[PDB]
Structures are given as C-alpha cells and as structure tokens.
Amino acid sequence: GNTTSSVILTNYMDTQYYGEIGIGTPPQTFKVVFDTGSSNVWVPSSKCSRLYTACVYHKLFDASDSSSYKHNGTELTLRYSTGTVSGFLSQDIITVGGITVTQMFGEVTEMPALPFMLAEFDGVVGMGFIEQAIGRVTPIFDNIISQGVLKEDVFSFYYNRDSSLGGQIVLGGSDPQHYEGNFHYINLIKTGVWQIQMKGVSVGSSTLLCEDGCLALVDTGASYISGSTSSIEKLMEALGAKKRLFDYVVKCNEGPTLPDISFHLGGKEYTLTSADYVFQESYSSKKLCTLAIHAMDIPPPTGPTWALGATFIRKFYTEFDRRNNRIGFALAR
Ligand SMILES: CCc1cccc(-c2c(F)cccc2[C@](O)(CCCNC(=O)OC)[C@@H]2CCCN(C(=O)C[C@H](O)CN)C2)c1
Ligand SMILES: CCc1cccc(-c2c(F)cccc2[C@](O)(CCCNC(=O)OC)[C@@H]2CCCN(C(=O)C[C@H](O)CN)C2)c1
C-alpha cells in the first residue's frame, strides 16, 4: 500500500497532546493520547461507576450502541507511575485517520480522580510493542502493519509550541513540512520498547551526568523530560533550581540565563536551551517559573531510565521505525 495518513493533535498548555479516534458502528469519538511508553489502548467505559468523577467528566464508550462490538470481558489492569486503572477487554472497529482496524482494547471501569480529573484526554492509544502489552493483546499499530496498507512500517510524531497547528502524528511515514534536514537514526537497544543508548548528559560545557552511559526512553505520552532522582537532583543543583512539592522552579528572570542542556545520542549532541525547557509565564524576579524537567524513577526492566517527553519531542521531530527497529531525529519546524 501507498497509504500515509495524518492525525491532527490538540496542544493543551504544552503538557497534554491528544487526538481523535472513532470506535464502533456508528463511530464513537474519543480524545486519546498516543503514547510510545505503553502498549495498550483503553478508553472510559459506560459501565464505569459514577462514583469515579473522571467517568462523569470524560466521554464513555457504550458497547451496546455499536453493532460491530464483540464481547470479551477479561479483566485488565494497567499500571502507570501515577497509579492503576482497571476494566475489562473488548473488541470493536477503531478508526484512526483514514485507517480502520478491528482492535482489542480496554474498557476502564475504574478511573482514579488523581491524575485523571486533570486529563483533557479521554483515553490512551499505546504505540509500544506487544512485549509491554498487559494481557499480551496485539497493539493497534501491529494490527495496522498486518493490513499492509502503510507506505512504510514507521510512524512519526510532531509536537508544537502552544500559542495554528497543535501537533501531528503520521502513520506510514513522516511529513517533510514539519522537519528540516535529514533524519539522524539511532537503533533500539532491544525490541519491545522504544529506548536508545544515551552516552551522557551535559549542562553547559561539561558533561556532568550519565557519564558511563544510561537509558533513554522516547515517550510521546511523557509531558516533561524525566530522569532518575539521583540524576535530576544533581541536574537541578547545577541549574540552581529549587524543589517545590510538585515541580522544580527558578526565578523567572533567571530562566533565560540558565545554561543549555544537551543529550548525546548516536554520537550527536541534542541541545535544549533554557527557552526550550522552561515555562516562562513572566520574566519578573518576584515570580517563580516551572521547569519542564523533573524526577521519575522507572522500575526495571524498563528502568532505571531517562524519559524524553514532549519537552524533547517539541524541538526534534521524531520518527519511530518498526521495520528497522530505530528512532529517527530531525530538527522540528
Ligand atoms: C496517558 C498517559 C498518562 C498517564 C497518567 C497520567 C497522565 C496525565 C494526566 F492524567 C493529567 C495530566 C498530565 C498527565 C501526564 O503528564 C501526561 C499527559 C499526556 N501525555 C502527553 O500528552 O504527552 C505529550 C503524566 C503525568 C505523570 C507522569 N506521566 C507519565 O508517566 C506518562 C508516561 O510517560 C506515558 N505512558 C505523564 C497521562
Ligand atoms: C506544575 C507542577 C507539577 C510538577 C510535576 C508534576 C505535576 C503533575 C502532577 F503532579 C499530576 C498530574 C499532572 C502533572 C503535570 O501535568 C506535569 C507532569 C509531569 N509529567 C512527566 O514528567 O511525565 C514524564 C502538570 C499539571 C498542571 C499543568 N502543568 C504545568 O507544568 C503548568 C505549569 O505551572 C506552567 N508554568 C503540568 C505538576
């Protein structure tokens, strides 16, 4: 097949990037985040108790409203760093862009208030490998490969700066409009996860972290860049940032003067200036500005690892290659 189809993404405050997918006949619309860090697709369910407030505020899937719905009903539990969602498995036809697929997805009957009452998205579409899929359910992208409609077996991500297009994901290729130059490709350490070897982390001129090498998970569902607590504690100390309850902050006036942060991947230096990784709401010295970096300790086998999230993707257009098991990087525009 020659097909390459694009899905438009809505950018909410440079934290949450989501798009729309139909489910069933007639299609039921859902706002979903496309996450390379998880392999499962799930949406809120009409069987979700209203005692969970998230199921009131978000859109619910009604199985009996779709004639293509096929019952499964196996228990499913997904674990994130934030907590757990629970539900049961179902199967229906899912539309993404111009592509339709019959897909096994979760129907979530348990949706904790924290985080999900802060979610502008209804659900998640896992772009990860089947190796990470709870219940070993075929991921959506694998079902798309089987259809052989794609021009290529690769898919790419584009995240924009809030201010116009929000963001775009392309299935089957990349969009030259949103990147310049050529892609620099880096192989995955192993199949089953989107992760690449990182040869170190630099603050300004000196490389202060990840000196002997570390893991970098490219995560399209990650809002920030996240490293191990040990790494971050040293990074923020070097930047002079102060730890709040949630975030790391710096005096808003000092933000533009913070040094650059470079990530060394595939022998090349990937730099993020203070303008890239700092939220500047004001430049006043009397206000504190949030940093787009924080600490998250990812448990093995996946961790300990860095996570390169929207902060990183925003500057660098990312191509995910299934056929060759590699990740391309190009300057975003
Ligand atoms: C479906 C992923 C997920 C799971 C749990 C909570 C949230 C969530 C949330 F409900 C409300 C606000 C913010 C978040 C996140 O900031 C990411 C939001 C969507 N990602 C996006 O657009 O990246 C461009 C998360 C907050 C906790 C740490 N996060 C993760 O661990 C996400 C994993 O990297 C991806 N599976 C981000 C999102
Ligand atoms: C703003 C203080 C803060 C710090 C750290 C985490 C949260 C948090 C949280 F606890 C629970 C849910 C969602 C969030 C955030 O989505 C960021 C999550 C990080 N994800 C990640 O690294 O994925 C790999 C925030 C939710 C509100 C909007 N956010 C902002 O950063 C707004 C800033 O105040 C703007 N200056 C993100 C909040």
Side-chain angles (χ1 to χ4, degrees), residues 112-135:
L114 175 275
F116 287 106
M117 283 298 289
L118 315 172
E120 298 291 324
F121 57 90
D122 296 321
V124 188
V125 169
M127 303 297 286
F129 297 74
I130 182 174
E131 282 82 342
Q132 302 284 67
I134 307 297

PDB file of all heavy atoms in Angstrom, residues 112-135:
ATOM      1  N   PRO A 112      -9.192   6.608  38.747  1.00  0.00           N
ATOM      2  CA  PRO A 112      -8.940   7.459  39.918  1.00  0.00           C
ATOM      3  C   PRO A 112      -9.017   8.940  39.573  1.00  0.00           C
ATOM      4  O   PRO A 112      -8.675   9.359  38.464  1.00  0.00           O
ATOM      5  CB  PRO A 112      -7.522   7.062  40.347  1.00  0.00           C
ATOM      6  CG  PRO A 112      -7.309   5.706  39.772  1.00  0.00           C
ATOM      7  CD  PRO A 112      -8.068   5.695  38.483  1.00  0.00           C
ATOM      8  N   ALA A 113      -9.473   9.736  40.544  1.00  0.00           N
ATOM      9  CA  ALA A 113      -9.522  11.182  40.358  1.00  0.00           C
ATOM     10  C   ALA A 113      -8.137  11.734  40.048  1.00  0.00           C
ATOM     11  O   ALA A 113      -7.952  12.501  39.096  1.00  0.00           O
ATOM     12  CB  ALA A 113     -10.101  11.852  41.605  1.00  0.00           C
ATOM     13  N   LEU A 114      -7.152  11.352  40.852  1.00  0.00           N
ATOM     14  CA  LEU A 114      -5.760  11.701  40.618  1.00  0.00           C
ATOM     15  C   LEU A 114      -5.119  10.583  39.807  1.00  0.00           C
ATOM     16  O   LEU A 114      -5.167   9.425  40.217  1.00  0.00           O
ATOM     17  CB  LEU A 114      -5.044  11.901  41.964  1.00  0.00           C
ATOM     18  CG  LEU A 114      -3.534  12.161  42.095  1.00  0.00           C
ATOM     19  CD1 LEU A 114      -2.756  10.847  42.098  1.00  0.00           C
ATOM     20  CD2 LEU A 114      -3.007  13.075  41.012  1.00  0.00           C
ATOM     21  N   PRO A 115      -4.515  10.906  38.651  1.00  0.00           N
ATOM     22  CA  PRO A 115      -4.409  12.137  37.852  1.00  0.00           C
ATOM     23  C   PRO A 115      -5.635  12.525  37.026  1.00  0.00           C
ATOM     24  O   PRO A 115      -5.752  13.684  36.634  1.00  0.00           O
ATOM     25  CB  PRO A 115      -3.248  11.819  36.914  1.00  0.00           C
ATOM     26  CG  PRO A 115      -3.380  10.368  36.671  1.00  0.00           C
ATOM     27  CD  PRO A 115      -3.936   9.758  37.933  1.00  0.00           C
ATOM     28  N   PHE A 116      -6.528  11.570  36.764  1.00  0.00           N
ATOM     29  CA  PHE A 116      -7.357  11.650  35.565  1.00  0.00           C
ATOM     30  C   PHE A 116      -8.389  12.771  35.597  1.00  0.00           C
ATOM     31  O   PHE A 116      -8.910  13.131  34.538  1.00  0.00           O
ATOM     32  CB  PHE A 116      -8.041  10.306  35.323  1.00  0.00           C
ATOM     33  CG  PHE A 116      -7.102   9.242  34.833  1.00  0.00           C
ATOM     34  CD1 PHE A 116      -6.684   8.222  35.670  1.00  0.00           C
ATOM     35  CD2 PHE A 116      -6.619   9.278  33.535  1.00  0.00           C
ATOM     36  CE1 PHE A 116      -5.811   7.250  35.217  1.00  0.00           C
ATOM     37  CE2 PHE A 116      -5.747   8.310  33.077  1.00  0.00           C
ATOM     38  CZ  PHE A 116      -5.342   7.296  33.919  1.00  0.00           C
ATOM     39  N   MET A 117      -8.690  13.354  36.759  1.00  0.00           N
ATOM     40  CA  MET A 117      -9.532  14.545  36.737  1.00  0.00           C
ATOM     41  C   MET A 117      -8.808  15.752  36.156  1.00  0.00           C
ATOM     42  O   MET A 117      -9.451  16.777  35.904  1.00  0.00           O
ATOM     43  CB  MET A 117     -10.046  14.877  38.141  1.00  0.00           C
ATOM     44  CG  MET A 117     -11.198  13.992  38.598  1.00  0.00           C
ATOM     45  SD  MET A 117     -12.679  14.137  37.573  1.00  0.00           S
ATOM     46  CE  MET A 117     -13.248  15.767  38.024  1.00  0.00           C
ATOM     47  N   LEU A 118      -7.499  15.654  35.940  1.00  0.00           N
ATOM     48  CA  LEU A 118      -6.725  16.691  35.273  1.00  0.00           C
ATOM     49  C   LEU A 118      -6.529  16.408  33.791  1.00  0.00           C
ATOM     50  O   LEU A 118      -5.850  17.183  33.111  1.00  0.00           O
ATOM     51  CB  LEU A 118      -5.360  16.846  35.948  1.00  0.00           C
ATOM     52  CG  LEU A 118      -5.375  16.875  37.477  1.00  0.00           C
ATOM     53  CD1 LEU A 118      -3.959  16.833  38.021  1.00  0.00           C
ATOM     54  CD2 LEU A 118      -6.112  18.108  37.976  1.00  0.00           C
ATOM     55  N   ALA A 119      -7.099  15.320  33.278  1.00  0.00           N
ATOM     56  CA  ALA A 119      -6.842  14.880  31.915  1.00  0.00           C
ATOM     57  C   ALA A 119      -7.818  15.559  30.963  1.00  0.00           C
ATOM     58  O   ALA A 119      -9.038  15.471  31.144  1.00  0.00           O
ATOM     59  CB  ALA A 119      -6.965  13.360  31.809  1.00  0.00           C
ATOM     60  N   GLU A 120      -7.278  16.231  29.947  1.00  0.00           N
ATOM     61  CA  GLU A 120      -8.087  16.750  28.854  1.00  0.00           C
ATOM     62  C   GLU A 120      -8.378  15.682  27.807  1.00  0.00           C
ATOM     63  O   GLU A 120      -9.142  15.942  26.871  1.00  0.00           O
ATOM     64  CB  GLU A 120      -7.377  17.936  28.196  1.00  0.00           C
ATOM     65  CG  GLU A 120      -7.154  19.119  29.128  1.00  0.00           C
ATOM     66  CD  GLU A 120      -8.439  19.826  29.507  1.00  0.00           C
ATOM     67  OE1 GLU A 120      -9.344  19.921  28.652  1.00  0.00           O
ATOM     68  OE2 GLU A 120      -8.544  20.288  30.664  1.00  0.00           O
ATOM     69  N   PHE A 121      -7.781  14.503  27.950  1.00  0.00           N
ATOM     70  CA  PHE A 121      -7.963  13.381  27.044  1.00  0.00           C
ATOM     71  C   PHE A 121      -8.836  12.319  27.699  1.00  0.00           C
ATOM     72  O   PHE A 121      -8.822  12.145  28.921  1.00  0.00           O
ATOM     73  CB  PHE A 121      -6.615  12.768  26.660  1.00  0.00           C
ATOM     74  CG  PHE A 121      -5.803  12.318  27.840  1.00  0.00           C
ATOM     75  CD1 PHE A 121      -5.924  11.030  28.330  1.00  0.00           C
ATOM     76  CD2 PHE A 121      -4.928  13.188  28.465  1.00  0.00           C
ATOM     77  CE1 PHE A 121      -5.182  10.616  29.419  1.00  0.00           C
ATOM     78  CE2 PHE A 121      -4.183  12.779  29.553  1.00  0.00           C
ATOM     79  CZ  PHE A 121      -4.310  11.492  30.030  1.00  0.00           C
ATOM     80  N   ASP A 122      -9.603  11.609  26.869  1.00  0.00           N
ATOM     81  CA  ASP A 122     -10.460  10.544  27.377  1.00  0.00           C
ATOM     82  C   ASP A 122      -9.682   9.257  27.640  1.00  0.00           C
ATOM     83  O   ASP A 122      -9.927   8.580  28.643  1.00  0.00           O
ATOM     84  CB  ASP A 122     -11.596  10.280  26.391  1.00  0.00           C
ATOM     85  CG  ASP A 122     -12.516  11.474  26.231  1.00  0.00           C
ATOM     86  OD1 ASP A 122     -12.795  12.150  27.242  1.00  0.00           O
ATOM     87  OD2 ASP A 122     -12.956  11.738  25.092  1.00  0.00           O
ATOM     88  N   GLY A 123      -8.730   8.920  26.778  1.00  0.00           N
ATOM     89  CA  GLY A 123      -8.109   7.616  26.828  1.00  0.00           C
ATOM     90  C   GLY A 123      -6.721   7.633  26.228  1.00  0.00           C
ATOM     91  O   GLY A 123      -6.149   8.693  25.964  1.00  0.00           O
ATOM     92  N   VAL A 124      -6.171   6.434  26.043  1.00  0.00           N
ATOM     93  CA  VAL A 124      -4.791   6.259  25.611  1.00  0.00           C
ATOM     94  C   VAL A 124      -4.738   5.243  24.480  1.00  0.00           C
ATOM     95  O   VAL A 124      -5.461   4.239  24.497  1.00  0.00           O
ATOM     96  CB  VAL A 124      -3.900   5.798  26.779  1.00  0.00           C
ATOM     97  CG1 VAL A 124      -2.430   5.818  26.377  1.00  0.00           C
ATOM     98  CG2 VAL A 124      -4.143   6.669  27.979  1.00  0.00           C
ATOM     99  N   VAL A 125      -3.882   5.509  23.497  1.00  0.00           N
ATOM    100  CA  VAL A 125      -3.560   4.563  22.435  1.00  0.00           C
ATOM    101  C   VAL A 125      -2.086   4.214  22.587  1.00  0.00           C
ATOM    102  O   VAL A 125      -1.214   5.047  22.309  1.00  0.00           O
ATOM    103  CB  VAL A 125      -3.850   5.137  21.042  1.00  0.00           C
ATOM    104  CG1 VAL A 125      -3.259   4.241  19.954  1.00  0.00           C
ATOM    105  CG2 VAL A 125      -5.348   5.306  20.840  1.00  0.00           C
ATOM    106  N   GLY A 126      -1.804   2.991  23.026  1.00  0.00           N
ATOM    107  CA  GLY A 126      -0.430   2.558  23.187  1.00  0.00           C
ATOM    108  C   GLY A 126       0.244   2.337  21.845  1.00  0.00           C
ATOM    109  O   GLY A 126      -0.255   1.559  21.015  1.00  0.00           O
ATOM    110  N   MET A 127       1.377   3.001  21.618  1.00  0.00           N
ATOM    111  CA  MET A 127       2.187   2.784  20.426  1.00  0.00           C
ATOM    112  C   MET A 127       3.361   1.846  20.677  1.00  0.00           C
ATOM    113  O   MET A 127       4.151   1.606  19.758  1.00  0.00           O
ATOM    114  CB  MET A 127       2.703   4.122  19.888  1.00  0.00           C
ATOM    115  CG  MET A 127       1.604   5.123  19.574  1.00  0.00           C
ATOM    116  SD  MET A 127       0.504   4.566  18.260  1.00  0.00           S
ATOM    117  CE  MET A 127       1.547   4.792  16.821  1.00  0.00           C
ATOM    118  N   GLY A 128       3.496   1.316  21.891  1.00  0.00           N
ATOM    119  CA  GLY A 128       4.598   0.441  22.218  1.00  0.00           C
ATOM    120  C   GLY A 128       4.430  -0.946  21.630  1.00  0.00           C
ATOM    121  O   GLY A 128       3.416  -1.293  21.025  1.00  0.00           O
ATOM    122  N   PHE A 129       5.465  -1.756  21.818  1.00  0.00           N
ATOM    123  CA  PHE A 129       5.483  -3.112  21.296  1.00  0.00           C
ATOM    124  C   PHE A 129       4.592  -4.028  22.130  1.00  0.00           C
ATOM    125  O   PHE A 129       4.262  -3.741  23.283  1.00  0.00           O
ATOM    126  CB  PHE A 129       6.906  -3.663  21.290  1.00  0.00           C
ATOM    127  CG  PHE A 129       7.850  -2.918  20.387  1.00  0.00           C
ATOM    128  CD1 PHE A 129       8.324  -1.665  20.733  1.00  0.00           C
ATOM    129  CD2 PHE A 129       8.276  -3.484  19.195  1.00  0.00           C
ATOM    130  CE1 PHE A 129       9.198  -0.986  19.904  1.00  0.00           C
ATOM    131  CE2 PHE A 129       9.149  -2.811  18.363  1.00  0.00           C
ATOM    132  CZ  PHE A 129       9.611  -1.560  18.719  1.00  0.00           C
ATOM    133  N   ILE A 130       4.205  -5.154  21.523  1.00  0.00           N
ATOM    134  CA  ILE A 130       3.417  -6.158  22.226  1.00  0.00           C
ATOM    135  C   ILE A 130       4.142  -6.683  23.457  1.00  0.00           C
ATOM    136  O   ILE A 130       3.497  -7.162  24.396  1.00  0.00           O
ATOM    137  CB  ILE A 130       3.058  -7.321  21.274  1.00  0.00           C
ATOM    138  CG1 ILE A 130       2.188  -8.355  22.003  1.00  0.00           C
ATOM    139  CG2 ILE A 130       4.325  -7.966  20.711  1.00  0.00           C
ATOM    140  CD1 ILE A 130       1.671  -9.471  21.119  1.00  0.00           C
ATOM    141  N   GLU A 131       5.476  -6.609  23.478  1.00  0.00           N
ATOM    142  CA  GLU A 131       6.228  -7.111  24.624  1.00  0.00           C
ATOM    143  C   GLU A 131       5.806  -6.435  25.922  1.00  0.00           C
ATOM    144  O   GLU A 131       5.888  -7.048  26.994  1.00  0.00           O
ATOM    145  CB  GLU A 131       7.729  -6.919  24.392  1.00  0.00           C
ATOM    146  CG  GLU A 131       8.360  -7.942  23.457  1.00  0.00           C
ATOM    147  CD  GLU A 131       8.163  -7.604  21.993  1.00  0.00           C
ATOM    148  OE1 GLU A 131       7.264  -6.795  21.682  1.00  0.00           O
ATOM    149  OE2 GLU A 131       8.911  -8.146  21.151  1.00  0.00           O
ATOM    150  N   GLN A 132       5.361  -5.181  25.856  1.00  0.00           N
ATOM    151  CA  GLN A 132       4.944  -4.436  27.036  1.00  0.00           C
ATOM    152  C   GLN A 132       3.440  -4.487  27.268  1.00  0.00           C
ATOM    153  O   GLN A 132       2.959  -3.905  28.244  1.00  0.00           O
ATOM    154  CB  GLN A 132       5.383  -2.973  26.923  1.00  0.00           C
ATOM    155  CG  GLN A 132       6.876  -2.774  26.743  1.00  0.00           C
ATOM    156  CD  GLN A 132       7.650  -2.973  28.027  1.00  0.00           C
ATOM    157  OE1 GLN A 132       7.723  -4.083  28.556  1.00  0.00           O
ATOM    158  NE2 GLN A 132       8.230  -1.894  28.541  1.00  0.00           N
ATOM    159  N   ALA A 133       2.691  -5.171  26.407  1.00  0.00           N
ATOM    160  CA  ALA A 133       1.236  -5.153  26.474  1.00  0.00           C
ATOM    161  C   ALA A 133       0.756  -6.059  27.599  1.00  0.00           C
ATOM    162  O   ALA A 133       1.075  -7.253  27.622  1.00  0.00           O
ATOM    163  CB  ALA A 133       0.638  -5.595  25.140  1.00  0.00           C
ATOM    164  N   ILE A 134      -0.007  -5.491  28.532  1.00  0.00           N
ATOM    165  CA  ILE A 134      -0.629  -6.297  29.574  1.00  0.00           C
ATOM    166  C   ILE A 134      -1.683  -7.188  28.933  1.00  0.00           C
ATOM    167  O   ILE A 134      -2.512  -6.724  28.138  1.00  0.00           O
ATOM    168  CB  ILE A 134      -1.236  -5.403  30.665  1.00  0.00           C
ATOM    169  CG1 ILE A 134      -0.197  -4.406  31.195  1.00  0.00           C
ATOM    170  CG2 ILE A 134      -1.798  -6.255  31.800  1.00  0.00           C
ATOM    171  CD1 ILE A 134       1.005  -5.046  31.868  1.00  0.00           C
ATOM    172  N   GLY A 135      -1.658  -8.472  29.277  1.00  0.00           N
ATOM    173  CA  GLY A 135      -2.514  -9.441  28.634  1.00  0.00           C
ATOM    174  C   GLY A 135      -2.050  -9.876  27.263  1.00  0.00           C
ATOM    175  O   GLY A 135      -2.749 -10.665  26.613  1.00  0.00           O
TER     176      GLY A 135
END
